């Protein structure tokens, strides 16, 4: 039997037991939590490191550098352990300690920056380090190796678990590799599939995703892939997520109970509606932050 | 169409790539963290409840009881919502908000409100035979399959003890010898999910005929190994699971060309705030 890395992907697709409207419009869950490192990110991290062991770029024994909100942090830490890389991650210091700790536990080098510096500052600091000789920068935000994972794996999966049937795909936007990569695959399907994407409102802190300031716009984005972009409230992200285990037994991050929000908006909108919503990790690395009770 | 229930079970079997004796043996771990609740107790929980319908005893609206505080509280709670059951759970110590998230409730002289007939039918995981049934029905066939029937030693960290019993249950009926070893703390070792009764037990579901040896693990080796599984193998798990692989390693050490499999009951994510993934010496 099988290797941890071949335990990444082929994730379950589960329809909403009870929640939301019912007007013929069905909603199915992409369960990325199940990934060995517990998030959607593992697909991209694998892709990224093995695609670049392939173009001869990186090689075991090497140090790798990434700036993270955590998940990709925890992701590349894992795979590295599996293949004998050393990792440093760059993260801001307002993210949770469960995020801190899982990255450390996998034996990666963790560097925290100010929250006032936040994600864009950790990117800036990432670039410098590498261009000073402190390691190789894989750059999930501009690496087309990240959306390739979804476009290769995620996308073809969603289609065959809905057969040839999905009408909508709702995705929470961070890196944007998921939406973009899943969008590539679907464009080619000789039927129409509407890819919807979600961003925090004005002042809406939700971990996993961002509306990226202008000069930090992910190179991998591609507006022609994204039909609509929806705006998601931080409280309606925590409200639906909590609604989701209580009412569905699906135990998820806020990013996920958010994407179900939009997904429900779509269904609540379109009847006849097969709407696959991305759930990114689980509820556990959010537990100690008071979001799931206190 | 699929559901969470069918996402319970058929977990990944994972071979150690660089920890163990270099003498012939192959240690393979069974990734029970994968369960939709992220622990082994999803299998029993669903069974326990599901089989309490094959024999009609509970209604999707019925009040279920169990005084647990951890993973069982999580899976049980987990499955009730799946099926529309009203679960109520009781107490640990004096940390685990992962229960009420699933919609549960806060709270004899074992120790350890109120009682069965009082308010709802308690599940009695420590006696309920549908505990090892799960392993007998699933966790046994799976490992048997995945290993090409090549498994020589089963290893398990022992709480409600159902896991080893059922898998031994299934194991015994196979046409080859399959030794079965349960893991227990040394009596002052504090390891979550496994305790050294009698502290007056054995659990009801236990079967000395089904075990083949019992090694004692200290707290220091469990925490240490779980430490090593993370950095050295990319395996991030809780402290009993750390104990499992250390037991498998002593077995492997004794039994050269062996094929050993140990259950990883859960991923280490609920453990991080304990700080148990900081090293010590
Ligand atoms: C990064 C991340 C996302 C975003 O997916 P991207 O492909 O980066 O757009 C969503 N949720 C979580 C928890 C994430 O970590
Ligand atoms: C369930 C559990 C055990 C024990 O397994 P049992 O089948 O109950 O003997 C050990 N450790 C942890 C973390 C568990 O959850």
UniProtKB/Swiss-Prot annotation, chain A:
Belongs to the cysteine synthase/cystathionine beta-synthase family. SUPFAM superfamilies: Tryptophan synthase beta subunit-like PLP-dependent enzymes. This is Cysteine synthase B. Homodimer. One of its GO terms (molecular function) is pyridoxal phosphate binding. One of its GO terms (biological process) is cysteine biosynthetic process. One of its GO terms (cellular component) is cytoplasm. Gene3D superfamilies: 3.40.50.1100. The modification N6-(pyridoxal phosphate)lysine is found at residue 41. Two cysteine synthase enzymes are found. Both catalyze the same reaction. Cysteine synthase B can also use thiosulfate in place of sulfide to give cysteine thiosulfonate as a product. Its EC number is 2.5.1.47. Pathway: Amino-acid biosynthesis; L-cysteine biosynthesis; L-cysteine from L-serine: step 2/2. Keywords: Amino-acid biosynthesis, Cysteine biosynthesis, Pyridoxal phosphate, Transferase. Pyridoxal 5'-phosphate binds at residues 71, 174-178, 255. Its cofactor is pyridoxal 5'-phosphate. It comes from Escherichia coli (strain K12). InterPro entries: Cys_synth (IPR005856), Cys_Synth/Cystath_Beta-Synth (IPR050214), CysM (IPR005858), P-phosphate_BS (IPR001216), TrpB-like_PALP (IPR001926), TrpB-like_PALP_sf (IPR036052). The keyword Kinase does not apply. It catalyses: O-acetyl-L-serine + hydrogen sulfide = L-cysteine + acetate. The keyword Transferase applies.
